[PDB]
Each structure stands twice: as structure tokens, then as C-alpha cells.
Amino acid sequence: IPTVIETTNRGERAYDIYSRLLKDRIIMLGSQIDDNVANSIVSQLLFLQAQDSEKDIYLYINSPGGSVTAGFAIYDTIQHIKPDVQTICIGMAASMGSFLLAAGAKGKRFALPNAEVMIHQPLGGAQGQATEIEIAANHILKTREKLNRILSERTGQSIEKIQKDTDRDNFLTAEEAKEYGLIDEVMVPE
Template identity: 40%
Template sequence: MALVVAAAALAPPGAQARSCRASRLSAPVAMRSTPKVPYKFPGMDEATWISIYSRMYRERILLLSQDIDDDFANQMIATLLYLESEDSKSPAAMYFNVGGGVMKAGLAVHDTMRMMPYEFQTVNMGMCAQVAAFLVAAGTKGKRFALPNARFRMENPTIEPMYDNEGKPRTRIMQATEMRLEVAEVLRDKRRVLEGFSSATGRSAEQLEQDFKRDFYLDANEALQYGLVDRLLLPGAKREGAEKGEISPGVGIG
């Protein structure tokens, strides 16, 4: 899993460290599943292998690379809360390449981000769809970025399907009254998302509702003009478009 909970990342590995000492100069067997890098924990004499995602976390860098469901959202929230207790002032950088997710789970992450006292740098690395696009736009104003080939897809929330024990979606059988309540709840989520996008982009909820009637795709430059991001991350040498006002000059995350 891309995001590793803080407690697992920070605890000195003890016996695990001693068992890894013999292999610290060569790639561990676990490298086949999750990349690992050597890291020397504070107070330890020797380095040990830890998940590369845990190492990124220690620099307050979070990579979101899977659909945002309830479990992943809970891990995300736990990590953001831990970052606050560890350092409530330094910004956190969130890198996204997410095809979508559960709207209510994303809203929970969004509300947690708003509650944190530190700033958020958000970066769309590839595709950010649905609630992932919403979270990128929710970053601190002036610190929302996209790579040149990044894409955004905005869409209306839908009634979430139910799944069987094997994880396969199955038909939901509901009474008419229950269906009406489900639709009302989806429309409520839609209003919350439109209000959030309106605050992030400066566009009216009416215009956003018109745009979101169908799946709405934006490339990086279009997202910049639309107000979803503030700058494009470009190599420093490629500034011709920036000088013409077409794109923003390359910037770094720091």
C-alpha cells in the first residue's frame, strides 16, 4: 500500500533491525514487492531497510496511488493527524495519481486537511479523477501543482454499489422510499463538492454544476486556467511558453 501509517514508519525496528544487518548492503528479499531503502533511525548505530513510502513519509511526503476507499482514507487521516503531533508548522506534500474513489471517504480526508494547522502542497502526477481532483484543488492556495501531462476528470457523485463476499458488485434492491433517500444523500454530497470546487477555483456553483453535467476532462493547462491548480511543474530550461504567458515557469516543491 502506498501510504504507510506513521506508527509503523517511526517505531525503531529492534529485533527486525538486527535481523536485517547482514543484508543491509544488498537489496532485501522484500524488494520484490515494495521498494526499500536504507535508513538510520535516530539513536541507532546502523541503518536498516524500510519501505520507500515510510522514508518519504519521514520527509512529510505522501503518495496517493490507489482509489480512495474507506480503509485508505482512514490511513490517510491517521497519518495527517500524526504529522500534526510531530510538527504542526512544516507543510506536507501530497502527490496524486488516483483514478477515483468513494466520495464520502474523500470528503473525510478533505475535512481533515482543512482542520490541520500546516499547509498542503498538492501535485497531480498523472490522472486525478472525481474525489482525487477535489483533494488536489483543496491544497493551500498558491501551492497546488500539476505536471505537464497530468489530467483531471470531474464527475458527479453516484450511488455507491454494494459488494458480495468476493468483492464483486451486486444489484441493490431497495424500496422506493429508500431509493429517494439515497438519491437525496447523493445530491447533498454533490452540493458539498460543488461548494468546495467553487471555493478552490473562484467559479460560481451554477457554472460548476453546468460543467459537471457530464464527465469533465481538463489537461494541465486547462486545469491551470480553470483554477484547479496554481502552477505547472516544468523543467527549468523549458520556459518559452512561460515567457509568453501560456504556462507557468517550472517550480520546485520545498
């Protein structure tokens, strides 16, 4: 992980590349979603909301998704904080990554032209007694209905369509995700 040196007209200082990007208000979501990752993202979004409650935040998303509860943590923090978070799919947004994509400010969800979006129903596991498997199934089905309903709200597709389309793994190009409504536009190559 490279270090960047920058002049400040009051001194000179060394940052990690991610910490300099964090000074620009850029958050890197570049790995699977787990507890440690969600804790980091939440702390970064809360620090940045504390520093400046008007300026946008830039969540960069390149992840295979991950834990649904940690994704809901990042979602709820993004909806709680005052400043708008702008989601940019850099190459890959799958599972909760494609949800954290669709979870950004309206008009401010972007993808690079060759980024991949995958939407699919959640994965889980159940073991032991029949009643324990019943409890786990009912919980994962409520989780899927919560995800589908948030997606229907943020995407404008009906819940029946999101149910049908997430049944198997649906791979979207950025143009397909723009026509779906998971993103607002595809970034024109400056």
C-alpha cells in the same frame, strides 16, 4: 516494494520507500479512495501534524478517486491540521482525487505537465421501495451540492458553471485545470 537503507550518524536503518518518503513528509495517494486508504491518509496527516505543526506536507495524488465520504474525511483532516498540505497531481486525479487536489493550500496546488484531471458528478445507486429511492436520490443530490459548493469556494468558478461542467465527464489538461482553478501552477520540468 523496495527497501531503502540510509545512514543516520547514530545508526543505520531500513525503510520502505513509502516510509522513507513519509520521513520527508510525503504522503502517497496512489490508489482508489476507500475506508482503509482514508484511514491511512488521516493517520499519516495526524502523525505529521503532531511531529511538526509548521512544515508543509506533500500529498502526491495519482488516483481514480473513490468513496466520497472517505474523500471528505481526507478533506476535513487536511483543513483541520495546522500545516499546509501541498497537492501534486502526478498523473491522474479523477472524481474525489481531483477534489483532494483542489483541496490543497492556495498557491501550493500543482500538476505535472502531462497529468490528467477529470471532474464529474458523483455516482451512486438506489434500490427497493419508491420512498427508499427518493431518500437515496435526495442524499446523492445533497452530496453533489456540497461538492459543487466546496469546489466553487476553492476554485472561484460559480456553482452554476461547476454544475454545468460536471454534468458529463470533463477531462482537463494541467493548463486547463490551472485556468479552471483546480491547481495553481504546472510544475516546470527541473
